[PDB]
Each structure stands twice: as structure tokens, then as C-alpha cells.
Design a protein around this ligand. Structure first.
Ligand SMILES: *[C@@H]1O[C@H](CO)[C@@H](O[C@@H]2O[C@H](CO)[C@@H](O[C@@H]3O[C@H](CO[C@H]4O[C@H](CO)[C@@H](O)[C@H](O)[C@@H]4O)[C@@H](O)[C@H](O[C@H]4O[C@H](CO)[C@@H](O)[C@H](O)[C@@H]4O[C@H]4O[C@H](CO)[C@@H](O)[C@H](O)[C@@H]4O)[C@@H]3O)[C@H](O)[C@H]2NC(C)=O)[C@H](O)[C@H]1NC(C)=O
Ligand SMILES: *[C@@H]1O[C@H](CO)[C@@H](O[C@@H]2O[C@H](CO)[C@@H](O)[C@H](O)[C@H]2NC(C)=O)[C@H](O)[C@H]1NC(C)=O
Ligand SMILES: CC(=O)N[C@@H]1[C@@H](O)[C@H](O)[C@@H](CO)O[C@H]1O
Ligand SMILES: CC(=O)N[C@@H]1[C@@H](O)[C@H](O)[C@@H](CO)O[C@H]1O
Ligand SMILES: CC(=O)N[C@@H]1[C@@H](O)[C@H](O)[C@@H](CO)O[C@H]1O
Ligand SMILES: CC(=O)N[C@@H]1[C@@H](O)[C@H](O)[C@@H](CO)O[C@H]1O
Ligand SMILES: CC(=O)N[C@@H]1[C@@H](O)[C@H](O)[C@@H](CO)O[C@H]1O
Ligand SMILES: CC(=O)N[C@@H]1[C@@H](O)[C@H](O)[C@@H](CO)O[C@H]1O
Ligand SMILES: CC(=O)N[C@@H]1[C@@H](O)[C@H](O)[C@@H](CO)O[C@H]1O
Ligand SMILES: CC(=O)N[C@@H]1[C@@H](O)[C@H](O)[C@@H](CO)O[C@H]1O
Ligand SMILES: CC(=O)N[C@@H]1[C@@H](O)[C@H](O)[C@@H](CO)O[C@H]1O
Ligand SMILES: CC(=O)N[C@@H]1[C@@H](O)[C@H](O)[C@@H](CO)O[C@H]1O
Ligand SMILES: *[C@@H]1O[C@H](CO)[C@@H](O)[C@H](O)[C@H]1NC(C)=O
Ligand SMILES: OC[C@H]1O[C@H](O)[C@@H](O)[C@@H](O)[C@@H]1O
Ligand SMILES: OC[C@H]1O[C@H](O)[C@@H](O)[C@@H](O)[C@@H]1O
Ligand SMILES: OC[C@H]1O[C@H](O)[C@@H](O)[C@@H](O)[C@@H]1O
Ligand SMILES: OC[C@H]1O[C@H](O)[C@@H](O)[C@@H](O)[C@@H]1O
Ligand SMILES: OC[C@H]1O[C@H](O)[C@@H](O)[C@@H](O)[C@@H]1O
Ligand SMILES: OC[C@H]1O[C@H](O)[C@@H](O)[C@@H](O)[C@@H]1O
Ligand SMILES: OC[C@H]1O[C@H](O)[C@@H](O)[C@@H](O)[C@@H]1O
Ligand SMILES: [Ca+2]
Ligand SMILES: [Ca+2]
Ligand SMILES: [Ca+2]
Ligand SMILES: [Ca+2]
Lengths: 389, 389, 389, 389
């Protein structure tokens, strides 16, 4: 084994093929399946695994009552074999807490969890299954991180974190790790005005993080990171195709260097994009208002062109079904000439959209790029809420 | 580890001994057992595994309701240790979809799943647990495959696929894979008029696939494949002993080169045969109308002689019990000078034949050849439907 | 790895220490635990495992109804990590059937299961997890074997099998296996008049099997096997201390060469003994009539002296609790200069003795020798039958 | 690959970070989770595991009724992957009994369990999964041991055991093991007047065991062990900060060489401390009467200074929540220059404090030292007792 180096370009992508689906809510109606939210996937030289924040209870259990609540001492980052649903029997605890990221550097896995009260949270950084570093809150307001995978290059794994208000200017930092140890800490610089829940991927020696501006923008901030120099720049996705939720109608032109505001009633959702000239794809909920549906839009030069619009689309989840967070990952250890973009959509079931149940949970679907023009259908959660009533 | 070569002849078979039985429906009455159908077994250097298409629900779960339906976004190919029943806790997801095949080449396992809507399905081809190739539907009508194992020789694994009507001429192809990559594609040639759900095995450098003509024939198509030249020929099993379901009474003579028009009310069922001159064995349901019972018939020269009839028989499942699909596999890595034929029978329970329950599932029984003359009994599913009422 | 040989002597035993207990019935009252009976343990270079014949249903499942019945197509030999209870999720299917034995030769494990109808049963012999040999019934009346571990010496593993009446003269054979292949078959020789369910162990290059005479004797047959010459002799335990169930009161003298009759209402139970001159121990149920209680008695020269009586005792299961079958095993791979005797007791719950439930199952306790004088208590099953009503 | 040597010093500790939490009671309200008590953690070269004494029943099972009872034939030491909750499906049985210790010497794991009746208990000492040695009771009154990990140096692992009354003078021994074999036995010497349930850790070639005086002292006894010379001394923690439960108010001065008595109604609880001059931390329940709350107190020179008081505190469990036993462990195989203190708190639920249920069980939280000043949260058992009514 050797350190992963981000030497390869992104693969050409013309459509998206099915990678995995865990059907967790369908199965968890009867089997012992943990309540989760904030899922993702991350790979290593041996393959890929699903990750999520457990609520420390099963879905049918009486303790599922109240799991709309985001932060508790009963949450933990868990991982499991891709495709399986998360049970108490097949899940690995990565760290304890209510916000996370994880990535493999080619040698071992780094996992990070924040826990604690809102005014006094702390991150614990784990490497190869052991705790290495702890980081106290710097702003006394919910120190928190990506909720999808980090990316490593020559053993250096940058991680984006935020501490401060969700609805105003906050203190975002990029922390550069190696074997779980802090190499360098940078304050956020550039034109992004607020940063949450970054979705990051690497290609051609550059890491790109596509994030959530919870304060103003319905356009997504983009942080571009040089993992060798350990420096970064930031701005917004230039395209007029707005990809946060809630958002207004797409304007005539986007804005590379400032938020495009508007939309109702919610300030943001975790999301992602792959940005590679003509080979650029933006995910978004189909609804401009709610976390419903999910579509992939091929928008050439989305990163640079304020007039860029879609040239193709693929519906991943139809607009009659619930979605949620979405994020980027790549199997960097695949036997391929290029790094092939993948993504997941979190399929939220229960509260607040479905208030006939006392709980909130999700299932997962994941897809990767194809150079072919593949047919598509909706990969919605598939559980019947009435069965849980 | 090296590539498997089909260098051995088939073992002499006089009797069939019990290999495995999972008793999934009996166990699943109380334990967390996934709803399945279209099962099979496939082996590798280390041992043998059971495979099936999950319905993404447990048997006692409320989502078992409606599982008569063949195609949904909640289906997946799953595999598990031979003999165990399939639960959410002991199963590996091989790929996502509603039609599959899988085989080990001696180095790693190739698995293929079709998914998507009827008019726009796609295959994803996996190797060593990673996605390698995607294949779009070529005829826009349920792109689909074997529902039992493929077979490999010197790294080349041919797979039979069909796209188009189930009740008319369709577009069948033989696709030759190596490490999940397409080496060659041939259109079906020869005298077989319709091809579904091929059951395939190898011996003496030749692969034979015994299939289901869903259009006209109650006699089964036979495809003979040279995996070195990557060429094939096709025709029908010659024997008067007709092996599809439904079928009419066995005629005075079979027909090597044309379908013999069937019985009532089913157009076909997946089945298999081992064809080796005198050492030839044909499986079929005992009922000529329906998926009930299962028998093995030794029919010397079934492949070449229209007058060939049985010289011995073994009842596998009595005709008072439900059967289903059946298929071939071989433990190619056994410590034996010959390749010993094995088969499974899918034991279907619930709908449509048992409509007092809302679900359709199955269990599995598997047997392999013996040179001895062994006694037999019926290996029926064994669950009491009344318990599920 | 190397083939095990049996050159070492038996360790001195002055009392018995607890090795394992699975509490299967206690746990299975509310967890998914398989119905079993006929358990045992067997070891290999890595450790020891528990074995039993599953009934192919959970204990709380509706299919547990009727599990008094000994033989069905839904039974299989399952193994699992010592001390765990047997669930559908942690058990390995060794083979399919309703009578078994198993042993490790130092290189791989051999497992044998009989299945089929009473008049036409057959054994399948597995080695290293693959089927090797099949053996048809020779007398047409429930071909059957030890229900505890066999024993191997320099690759040769003898197994005692019986085919014929349970209540009169039957056809017993010793079959000598190597790598699952038949080396030699011998008809039973000597003065034992009937043989069932042998409990076997090795020491000093010799295998002793202590069996059950179901026809006449309340004293136990003893078969002495030389695994190098592949020959055997047979007689009865000489001691006046009678160890089958049912049995009469112990007489003033035993009989080395004929069955001692008497006892009511049961013709026999599987049991065991370790016979090593002054270092000899006999197990038996505490009740003379019924399968209740269990005691270990140190009976110097039990194998050779008709007047031999106990010089020490250890109650293993008190006489207010149900026992069942018992048998011998040894960890032949321990880091010791001698082979230390171990045994298990099957703790039967449910029918026929506990008729308030519809099922029959068991749990397991296992103990090994100590040279120390250890205190003792009763290791009964521990479940409350009322909880299952 | 090598025997652990206790060469490294203790790391500097300024606050405590979360390591693991299993949330067993919350999860076990619906999933199949074993009833336990007396938990701990122990690590090896590969990772850390949770340990506890099972009660041989699940929490929702009818057999959970009466599990306040400490000693039965149905208890066993089980271990499982750190962070998971203990189920019948993911737990390894280490040994059978109702008092235990375990530790890894760098090569293999030693586990010890006591079992049997009060007047005649015995220990069985296991090494690398096999039984090695048995020790009969020397005082005929509940032979018993640490209930948390032992510590090894150059293959020698000392273990503190007690036999005799809980409420008067008893017979304590230190037994030095290597590969599970007794190297030396010492009678307790020094000023400690009664010893129970030692919590032990090593640093700089010295092992320090912080114990429970159940006879007199509310201050904790401290046994100091030289694992090379295999010798020891004993006394009490000097600090006026009393750390047993029940205890009186902290006096003006502690006493290094004799018990500080008082407190009501209970004579003791298992506890721990790390003692390293200025770098010294004492755990205790927040309540001086009952097993509620848990606090860590930095008490410089607690081991040597009768006037030493706290200079910092961290609430681990709030005083509105139930706690229980606590103990020391260290990941001796961490990639760090110093050994980092860790500890766990047992979070007892059910009887006798919560008598609305018929059972007694626990969950686990574990924390390790940080050199940082981290914020803190209460890590209580998050279950709602009403859900179990
Ligand atoms: C314990 O298990 C054993 C295995 O050792 C099992 O063996 C089986 O026994 C039966 C006979 O009992 C064998 O049955 C034979 O099967 C063939 C083929 O049958 C299929 O096809 C025919 C035609 O379509 C169907 O009617 C039939 O239902 C099957 O689907 C038949 O051709 C055989 O018929 C001949 O033998 C009969 C006597 O056995 C005659 O009565 C009959 O007239 C036929 O005779 C002619 O051929 C004989 C040569 O086989 C010859 O001896 C005669 O002189 C004459 O020319 C027959 O029905 C079956 O193959 C065996 N299976 C295996 C795997 O070995 C035992 O029966 C069972 N024992 C028990 C229960 O105690
Ligand atoms: C039985 O097995 C033992 C243990 O493997 C063999 O012991 C070896 O004996 C030879 C002398 O015959 C010594 O040189 C070796 O050092 C021994 N090996 C060990 C690891 O103890 C023994 O040879 C075997 N006996 C037979 C006849 O097979
Ligand atoms: C069915 C159920 O348990 N409902 C509970 C309710 O009683 C409680 O008031 C609420 C807040 O804790 O949580 C929910
Ligand atoms: C392919 C590439 O970029 N070269 C790198 C090299 O610079 C680096 O020192 C090493 C360790 O990460 O991995 C390789
Ligand atoms: C029969 C059918 O397919 N549709 C029913 C629908 O009418 C009903 O409202 C619902 C709740 O029971 O179940 C479904
Ligand atoms: C077991 C075996 O012979 N495997 C062979 C491999 O060694 C060889 O490179 C190849 C070409 O024949 O086919 C395969
Ligand atoms: C018992 C049960 O769940 N039955 C349901 C029925 O209510 C529903 O109408 C149908 C299709 O949705 O699926 C089935
Ligand atoms: C107190 C008591 O029961 N005495 C027992 C004795 O009977 C027994 O022989 C010995 C070893 O088993 O342990 C002691
Ligand atoms: C309702 C019930 O179980 N009755 C029991 C009774 O038989 C027993 O004597 C007592 C002691 O445990 O507890 C109560
Ligand atoms: C660092 C380590 O674990 N290795 C040591 C080795 O250097 C030393 O010779 C021995 C002393 O007995 O103990 C072991
Ligand atoms: C609900 C339940 O099982 N309660 C039982 C009670 O009947 C019995 O008296 C006691 C002692 O055995 O154990 C408890
Ligand atoms: C704002 C706040 O609560 N800060 C607290 C601080 O008082 C304490 O030193 C620490 C450890 O418990 O937790 C943090
Ligand atoms: C148990 O099985 C017997 C025999 O089939 C049947 O009479 C009875 O109804 C069954 N009882 C239950 C409760 O399933
Ligand atoms: O409704 C789903 C989605 O499909 C695509 C577009 O054609 C729109 O109709 C819509 O945004
Ligand atoms: O001889 C009648 C018998 O012969 C053979 C088979 O074709 C059977 O289906 C048929 O019943
Ligand atoms: O092939 C099985 C077949 O064999 C012959 C007859 O005994 C039939 O009744 C039976 O169904
Ligand atoms: O009573 C004498 C006593 O001796 C010994 C055994 O044979 C016992 O069964 C018997 O009770
Ligand atoms: O061996 C057990 C046996 O030992 C003696 C007596 O104490 C008996 O009552 C008891 O049954
Ligand atoms: O200030 C009083 C305070 O001092 C310190 C400890 O002894 C505490 O138990 C006590 O409450
Ligand atoms: O260490 C816990 C302790 O810390 C300080 C005070 O707030 C106390 O009331 C509290 O009990
Ligand atoms: Ca926004
Ligand atoms: Ca047909
Ligand atoms: Ca008898
Ligand atoms: Ca005390």
C-alpha cells in the first residue's frame, strides 16, 4: 500500500449508472435497522463502504421517537459494507458525535466526529481506528464539518470545518491532516460568504469542495484546494443554474463572486457538483422549495460561465418522492485511467415532511458516471409510510 | 490463483446426492429473512455461495405485500454462504437490479445486474466487487440475462442476454467478458428461435447453455459456445423428453431444429440439462402444466437422438409440492479429475399458486452427481402456509 | 499444518472445570435461535466449535411445533463458535441430514450427514467443505452414526455407523476415511451385541468408542480401534457401575462380555467414558429411569474390573433438571504433553418431558479435566418453561 | 509480534475526550441485546474491545427478570468490537463465570473467569482462546477478581484476586501469569486493609492498581506492582478527596496508610485513578451516597499529599443520571510516545434504583485523556425507562 496521489483526470460522464441502494426503511419496517441521517459513502483500496450518523436506536424501537433532533450524546458515525442496511449487527463505530467526515489516504482511514454541547463542542480525529488529535470549538457555536468524505493527496487530507452562526457570518477553517495530525490550519479566504457541509473530490492534483451557503446564496460556494501548497481560494458556482434548496427561479445570469439570494422557506441543503469544463454536472432537488426529487444536470462550464445552462438531464428521484442531502465520492483505487465521479442521495423519511410517524431517518442510493447514454428510472426510498402508522 | 480452464470432462452420474438446503421460508416465518426469487449457486476457489434477487424487504415485513411483481428499484443481487438462509445480516450485495448472472474466473468474481424501466434498462458489469462496464438496452424491451451462473475459460466468461418481446422474435446476444471488459459481442446464430434464462456449464473446453424458449417451444434451446474462438452455434435439445413448462405429452420423436409447440397455461420456466452422450441428465417439473414437482431423468444421447427416452429417474421434489426455476452450476475447483454436475431447484411459496398470503418468495435446494446408486426423498420447501395466515 | 497423531497419553483428571455453556433456550426465548438436538463439540488447530442438528426453524417460530420428530428433509448439521447460541446468522451448514459426525485431521475438517427416508438413507462425506464420498444404506433401516466427534490419526479417521433395527441385531460397520475417501470398511466384530451413537476419543495411538446398546444392555459397549492397522475389537464396560438409561440398580458385579438387562422405560441414551486404568471416569444420568441429572464418577479400572466402583463424584447437572445425550471430545491441539479429556451434556427442553410446549430443543454445557480438586455446581439449562407457555 | 513492555510514561492529561459509547439499553429496547453488568474495555495490537459479564438472556426477554442477582451458572465473560452493543450475534465468549479480568500481553489475550458456588468457586485461566490453568478457592467465600483489565510486561501479567468476606478481613493474592501459567503467588502485604475490584494500568515499568476497600475505607487502596521482580506494596490514596461510594464529606486531611471510614448506606463501588504526580486524576460518583453522576477531578499529588485537592473537574455523567462501576484501560499499542489514560463508566439501568422494571443491566461510555482543554457533555445512558414499562 502507498499514499493516494490525485494524478488522474476525471472520467468523461454522459449519464449515471446505479452503484448501490440499501432500502433501509423498507427493510427496517421489520428487521433491526438503526435510525440514521447524514449518510455518505467512502472507498479504500479494498472497496467502498456506506457511512451515516446513527441516532443510537432502531427504527421500530420506542427511542426512534424524537429523532428529528440533530444533536445528542447517543449519535455516532457508523460504517458498513456497501449495499447492506445499517443494523446493530453489521455496523462499525468510527467515532462518537453528531457531525462527521472520513477518507482513506491509501494507507489507513481518517475519521472525524464532533460532539458536545452547542457552546462547547470538540472534534476527535481518528486514524487507523485510533484517536490521534482533538480540536476544541473556536467560536462556541456548533463546531461542525462536511457530512461526506474528505480527499487525500500524498498523505495530506484537507477538511473543511465551520464554527459559528448558521444564519450569519461564521468562522470556517481548512485543516490539513496527515496520519491524523494537524499539518496546517487556514482561515477561509476569498469570495464565499458562508460555508457548510462541503462535498469534495480530487482530480489532476486539485481538490474541489462544493458547499452550502446557509446565510445568503442559492448558488453554491466552491472552495478550490491545493493539497501540496496547502492553500485555497473560494467563490461561487458561476452558472445561472441554482442548486441549493430553497432557491428562486434560475436568473438570466449567475454570479461567480457573490451569492444569488432568494427562495423560500429554507436556507440550504448539503449538495455537490463535479466541475471539469465541458464535463460538468450539477445535482439538485427537483423542487425549488422542498427536499423532494433529485436531478443531475450536465452544464458545460458551470464553474466559469454565468450564462451556462443544462444540455442534458437525468432524474434520479422523481418529484413525488423525498430526497435530502447529497454528496460526492470517488473510488480512487479503481482499475481505470481516470477518476470516475460518484454521488449519493440521502432519502429522508418521516419528520418533518411525514408527520404521521414520530421519527426521522433515511435510506441511501448511490450512482457513478458512465460514458454511455444509459436509460434511467427513479430510485426513491420505496417504503410505505402507512405501514409505520 | 490462476484463471480456471475447462480442461476436465464431466463426471459419470448415476444418482444425485444432497448438497445444500436453506429452509428459508420455514426460518423466515420468525427470523429476519429477505424476500427473494430467481436464486442460484456459484462457486469459487474457496467454496460455494447461494445467490438470489432480493425484493428489499423481509418475509414477515409489511413490504412483502406485492412481491409477486418481478421488477422494482428495490431489487438487488445478493450472495451468502451456502446453506444459510438470506438475512439483512449475512448477505453481500453483488449489484442492483432485477435480472442477473455471476461467475468466478479463478481470480475474481464477475457479477452482472440489469435494472431500469422496461423500455430503457441497462446492465452494470462488476468484477472483483467494482463496476467495470455498462451496457444500454439495444431493443428497448427488458434487457435481461441468465438467472444462474456464467462459466469462464482462460479468463473469458461468455454471458447470454436477451432484449425484446417475451412472446415473439427477440434480440439475443452472446457477450464475452474478461475482467469485466467486453472482448466480443455476437448476435445469436443458429436454429434456436427464442432464448431466455440460459443455464450453462463447461467441460472439455466447451460451454453448453440450456435455455427457455418462451415463444413457441416446449423443447429447450441449446447454445454451444467455444470460449477460445468466441463463437457459438444453436439448436434445440433433440430428445422427445420435453423439458419446459408448460408442455404437452412427450411425442414419439423430438425435434433438434424447431420448437415443438407447448402446453397450457405457462409459456416457459428456467431449466437445465447436462449433455454428455450416454451420461446425459434432463431436469423438469413433474407437472406438465405447472411449476410443481421436480424430477431428474437420465436420457442417453438426449442432445443428438430424437428417439432418446429415460433409462433412470430420481424424484427431487414430489408433485404435491411447488418447485420453480432450476439451473446448473459446478464446483470447478473441486479436488477431482472430472467436473461433477450440480443443480438447484427454486422452491416457490406464496403467490400466485398460494394466494392466502400477499407475498411471493422461495427457498433453495441443491444437489450434485454421484456415481453410486443412492436412495432419495422429496426436498420440498417444508413451510406451513397456514402459519403465515 | 500437519496430520494429527494420537501418540500422547490422557492427562490425569481429578475433577472437571467449566469450558463452555451456550444458554441457548434462555436466549432463544426472545432472540432468533434455531431449534436443535444431538449436539457436540469438536476442535481443530485454531480452537473448538459447537455442533448440532438443526430442525430448520427458530425456537419461538411456529415451525418449532412438532420438533420432537427426529428425521425430516429440514434438518442439517450446523457448527458455530463455542459458547455462542446457534442462530440463523452465526451458524455454518456442515452438511444436510439427521444424523452426523465430524472431526479435524489436523489439515481439514471431515463432516458426515445421513439423510433420506428410513428405507433408503445415504451418507454424504465432506472434507474441507466439499463433498467427497457418498454411502448408500446397506440394511435399508435408518443408516446412522455417532452424533459426536470422530477422531483422526495420521490422516485416518475411523467412523462407527449402524444400519438396521434399533431394538434387535443390526448391521454396524467401521469405516476408515482419509481426506474423505474410504480406505477400508469392516463389519463389527467382538462381543458387543448392538451399537448406537458411539462417543470416541484417542490416546496412546488407540481410539476408544463408548457406545449405546439399545437392544439389551444397561452396560455400555466399548469398541477399541487401531487407526494404523485399521482393525477393531469390541466388548462391554466391565464395571458394575451401569451407565446407560434406563438401567436397573447397580449389581454387585458387572459383565465385560455380555449385556446386563433391566431398567424401564427407555432402551438407551448416548453417553461416554474415559478409560485409562486408575485414571478412568464414567458419566451417566443421575436418574436410573429418565434423562435427568448428570454425574461424573471416577471408577478406577472400569474397563477391566467387574467389581470396580466409584472413588469420587462430581454432579454436573442436578437431578431436578433435564439432561440428554452426552459425548466425548478433546482439544488434540492444546499446548500440553497429554490429551485432556472433555465432554458435553445436551440439556433437553420441551417434549416429551415438558408437554406444555409444542417443541423439543436443547442447550449445551461442556467441561474438561483438571488435576486440581475444584468445587462444583449444577450447570442446568436455566430456562423457565412457563415463559414459553 | 512481541511481548508488550511498559516502558513509556503516562501522557499529560488536561481534559477527557469521548472514545466510545454503545447505547446498549436504548438499542436493546427493540433489538436483541444481552443483559450485562461489570463491563470494561481492553485493547490489543489491532484495536480495542468492550467486555462484560452476560446474564445469558436478552434485555426484552422474559429471562431478564431477576437479573439483579450477581452469580448464576448462566453468566459468561463476553467481548465485542468497541462501540457496538452486545448481542447474541456479535459477541465472543471469553470464559464462563461471574467475575473476570482480561488483558493482552502483545502476543495473545489472557482471560480469567471465576464460577461455581459461594463456598467453592474456581477460576479458569484462558490464553489465546484455550484453557490453561484452574485455581480453586482458598478461603471458601466467593473467589473473585478485578472486573476490568489486567496489565502485562515482558509476558508477565499480574492479577489481583480476593477470597473471603466482603465486610471483614479477607484473603487477597497477587498472581503473576505468563502465557496463562502461574509464575508466582503473593499474599497481599502492606497497609491496604481490604481489597476488591482493582483497576490497574502501567507506565515506566510500574503497575498501579486502584481498588475498592469494602470493609472500612472511603479512600481507595493502591497496590503498586513491579512486574519484573514480581513484588508489590500497598497503602491508600493520600488525598482528602475521597473517591469510593458511599463516602462521608471530604475531611481536612486524607490518610496514606489507613482507611478513612464513614458514609451511608453502601460499603463500596469499583473505581479507578491515574497517579502521576501533578498529572493525577481521580474519578468518582458525584453523589456521595449513591451510584449517580460521574466526575473526573485533577488532584495534583493525590498519591503522596494528604492535603491535595482538585484544580479542575469534568462532569462525565450528570448527577440526575445513574452511573456504576468505573475502571482504567490504556491502548498500550497506540502510535504515541506516551501511554494515554482511558476509562469507562458503567451506566446501570433497572434494579434496584429503577424498580418499575424486573431487570438490571447497563450500557457503557469510555473516554481518554487530551492535552487540550476540551468542552464537555454528560454521556448518560439515554434510555427512557417508561418505554420498558
Ligand atoms: C431407493 O433409491 C433408489 C436408488 O438406488 C431407487 O432407485 C430407482 O429405482 C427405480 C425402480 O424402483 C428406477 O426406476 C426406473 O426408471 C426408468 C426411467 O423412468 C423414467 O421414465 C419412464 C419412461 O418415461 C417413466 O415411466 C418413469 O416414471 C420415469 O420418469 C424406467 O425405465 C425403469 O423401468 C424399468 O425397470 C422397472 C423395474 O425397476 C420395470 O418394472 C420396468 O418394466 C422397466 O423395465 C425394463 O428395464 C429394466 C432396466 O432398467 C430391465 O431390468 C427390465 O428387464 C426391462 O427391460 C424404472 O422404472 C430408478 O431409475 C432408480 N433410480 C436411481 C437413481 O437409481 C429405489 O427404487 C429406492 N428404493 C426403495 C424406495 O426402496
Ligand atoms: C506425531 O506428531 C508429533 C507432533 O508433531 C511428531 O513429533 C515430532 O517428532 C519428531 C521425532 O519423531 C521430532 O523430531 C519433532 O520435533 C516432533 N515435532 C513436534 C513439533 O513435536 C511425531 O513425529 C508424530 N509421530 C508420528 C509417528 O507420526
Ligand atoms: C408513543 C410515544 O412514546 N410518544 C412519546 C410521548 O409520550 C412523549 O411526550 C414525547 C416527548 O418525550 O415523545 C413521544
Ligand atoms: C505519482 C506521484 O504523484 N508521485 C508521488 C510522490 O511524489 C510521493 O512522494 C509518494 C508518496 O505520497 O507517492 C508518489
Ligand atoms: C386497494 C389499493 O390498491 N389501494 C389501497 C387504498 O385504497 C387505501 O387507501 C390504502 C390504505 O389501506 O391501501 C391501498
Ligand atoms: C490452473 C491453470 O493452468 N491456469 C492457467 C494459467 O496458469 C495460464 O496462464 C492460462 C493459459 O493457459 O490459463 C489458466
Ligand atoms: C395488509 C396490507 O398491507 N395490504 C395492502 C393493501 O392494504 C394495499 O391496498 C395493497 C396495495 O397497496 O398492498 C397490500
Ligand atoms: C464446601 C464443599 O462443598 N466442599 C467441596 C468438596 O465436597 C469437594 O470435594 C471439593 C472439590 O470438588 O470442593 C470442596
Ligand atoms: C407469580 C409467581 O411467579 N409466583 C411466585 C411464587 O411461586 C414464588 O414462590 C415466589 C418466589 O420467587 O415468587 C412469586
Ligand atoms: C520495543 C519492543 O516491544 N521490543 C522489545 C525488545 O527491544 C527487547 O529486546 C525486549 C526486552 O525484553 O522486549 C521487547
Ligand atoms: C412477569 C414475570 O415473569 N414475573 C416473575 C414472577 O412471576 C416470579 O415470582 C419472579 C421470581 O421467579 O420472577 C418474576
Ligand atoms: C462555555 C462552557 O461551558 N465552557 C466549559 C468550561 O467551563 C469547562 O472548563 C469545560 C470542561 O468541562 O467545558 C467547557
Ligand atoms: C401443531 O402441529 C399439529 C400437527 O400438525 C397441529 O395439530 C396443531 O394445530 C399445531 N399447533 C399450532 C399452535 O400451530
Ligand atoms: O418533474 C421532474 C423534472 O423533470 C425534468 C423536467 O422536464 C421538469 O419537468 C422537472 O424539473
Ligand atoms: O412411457 C410413458 C412415459 O415415457 C417417458 C416420458 O416421455 C414420460 O413422460 C411418459 O409418461
Ligand atoms: O421421474 C419420476 C417418475 O418415475 C416413474 C414413475 O414412478 C412416476 O410416477 C414418477 O413421477
Ligand atoms: O449404593 C451404592 C452406590 O455405589 C455406587 C453406585 O453403584 C451407586 O449407584 C450406588 O448407589
Ligand atoms: O454422584 C452424585 C451422587 O453423589 C453421592 C450422593 O451425594 C448422591 O445423592 C449424589 O447423587
Ligand atoms: O468546596 C467544597 C468541595 O471541595 C472539594 C471536594 O472536597 C468537594 O467534595 C467539596 O464539595
Ligand atoms: O465536578 C462536578 C462539580 O463541578 C462544580 C460544581 O458545579 C458542582 O456543583 C459539581 O457537582
Ligand atoms: Ca443557501
Ligand atoms: Ca416454452
Ligand atoms: Ca441400553
Ligand atoms: Ca469503601
Amino acid at each position: 500500500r502507498t499514499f493516494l496521489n490525485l494524478t488522474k483526470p476525471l472520467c468523461e460522464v454522459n449519464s449515471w449508472h446505479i452503484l448501490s441502494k440499501d432500502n433501509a426503511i423498507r427493510i427496517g419496517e421489520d428487521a433491526h435497522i438503526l435510525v440514521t441521517r447524514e449518510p455518505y459513502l467512502s472507498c479504500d483500496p479494498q472497496g467502498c463502504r456506506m457511512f451515516a450518523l446513527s441516532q443510537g436506536t432502531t427504527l421500530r424501537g420506542r427511542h426512534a421517537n424524537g429523532t428529528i433532533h440533530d444533536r445528542s450524546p447517543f449519535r455516532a458515525l457508523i460504517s458498513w459494507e456497501m449495499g447492506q442496511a445499517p443494523s446493530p449487527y453489521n455496523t462499525r463505530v468510527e467515532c462518537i458525535g453528531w457531525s462527521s467526515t472520513s477518507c482513506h489516504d491509501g494507507m489507513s482511514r481518517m475519521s472525524i466526529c464532533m460532539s458536545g454541547p452547542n457552546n462547547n463542542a470538540s472534534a476527535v480525529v481518528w486514524y487507523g481506528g485510533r484517536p490521534i488529535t482533538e480540536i476544541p470549538s473556536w467560536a462556541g457555536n456548533i463546531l461542525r464539518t462536511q457530512e461526506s468524505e474528505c480527499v487525500c493527496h500524498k498523505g495530506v487530507c484537507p477538511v473543511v470545518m465551520t464554527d459559528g452562526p448558521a444564519n450569519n457570518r461564521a468562522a470556517t477553517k481548512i485543516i490539513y491532516f496527515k496520519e491524523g495530525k494537524i499539518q496546517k490550519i487556514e482561515e477561509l479566504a476569498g469570495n464565499a460568504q458562508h460555508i457548510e457541509e462541503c462535498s469534495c473530490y480530487g482530480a489532476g492534483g486539485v481538490i474541489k469542495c462544493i458547499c452550502r451557503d446557509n446565510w445568503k446564496g442559492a448558488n453554491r460556494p466552491v472552495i478550490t484546494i491545493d493539497p501540496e501548497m496547502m492553500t485555497h481560494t473560494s467563490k461561487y458556482l458561476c452558472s445561472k443554474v441554482l442548486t441549493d434548496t430553497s432557491r428562486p427561479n434560475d436568473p438570466t445570469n449567475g454570479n461567480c463572486d457573490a451569492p444569488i439570494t432568494g427562495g423560500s422557506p429554507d436556507p440550504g441543503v448539503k449538495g455537490f457538483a463535479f466541475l471539469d469544463g465541458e464535463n460538468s454536472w450539477l445535482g439538485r432537488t427537483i423542487s425549488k422549495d422542498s427536499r423532494s426529487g433529485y436531478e443531475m444536470l450536465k452544464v458545460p462550464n458551470a464553474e466559469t460561465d454565468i450564462q451556462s445552462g443544462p444540455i442534458s438531464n437525468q432524474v434520479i428521484v422523481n418529484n413525488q418522492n423525498w430526497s435530502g442531502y447529497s454528496g460526492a465520492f470517488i473510488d480512487y483505487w479503481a482499475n481505470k485511467e481516470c477518476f470516475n465521479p460518484c454521488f449519493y442521495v440521502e432519502l429522508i423519511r418521516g419528520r418533518p415532511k411525514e408527520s404521521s410517524v414520530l421519527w426521522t431517518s433515511n435510506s441511501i442510493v448511490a450512482l457513478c458516471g458512465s460514458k454511455k447514454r444509459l436509460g434511467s428510472w427513479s430510485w426513491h426510498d420505496g417504503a410505505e409510510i402507512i405501514y409505520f402508522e
